[PDB]
């Protein structure tokens, strides 16, 4: 385990690096949660009904 550890780390870091650059260029690292989205759409529906 200890010997394969170094190389598995290198590999995992790679697959994390690609993940990070895309999160920056395409979503501008905007935080997103279900509760946020839901509350926001709900305030939309409410203004519409009002």
């Amino acid at each position: 385990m200890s010997s394969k550890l170094n190389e598995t780390t290198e590999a995992i870091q790679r697959e994390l690096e690609e993940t990070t650059y895309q999160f920056k260029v395409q979503y501008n690292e905007q935080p997103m949660s279900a509760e946020s989205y839901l509350a926001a759409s709900l305030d939309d529906f409410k203004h519409q009904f009002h």
Partner: protein, 50 residues
Amino acid sequence: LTNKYYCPEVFLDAVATKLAQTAVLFLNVEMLNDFYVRFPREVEAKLHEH
């Protein structure tokens, strides 16, 4: 405008205007839009927590 070193006033005010407008663009997007989306959510959260 060819005699810029003759008329520093007008030149300096153009530089001010331009800087101002492009900093306004970046300001409008980053600060202002982030306020538009994050402000209801933060009201909600902090009003509920209070």
